Amino acid sequence: LFIDDDTVHPLLGSHVRLTEEPERHVWQGDVGTSVLSWLSDHQVHNVAALP
Amino acid sequence: LFIDDDTVHPLLGSHVRLTEEPERHVWQGDVGTSVLSWLSDHQVHNVAALP
Secondary structure (H helix, E strand, C coil): CCCCCCCCCCCCCCCEEECCCCCEEECCCCCCCCCCHHHHHHEECCEECCC | CCCCCCCCCCCCCCEEEECCCCCEEEECCCCCCCCCHHHHHCEECCEECCC
16 A cells, blocks of 8 residues: 656647747647546547547 | 745757658757856856856
8 A cells, every 4th residue: 555656838748949940839749548548538439539 | 034945858958759851859958057057167268158
């Protein structure tokens, strides 16, 4: 019997400013039921689909 | 009298997998003395510059 653990920027991911050309912004995050377990509440045709 | 209250690689600052053609790894961060107060020691001609 023991409890173990496993900024506040959203699920977008690490925002980066791209200055190579006319500027771009990239986040490159990861989503899914692994971290966003509540997404299971939208399983389309019994398959978890992002609303 | 009270407490002041003040994982990512420090120098890199952030990572992103910009997986276009060609595949590029990109990092964006800050190394100023505001964060790296320790880094202020390395100064040439009394001007702080990282080695």
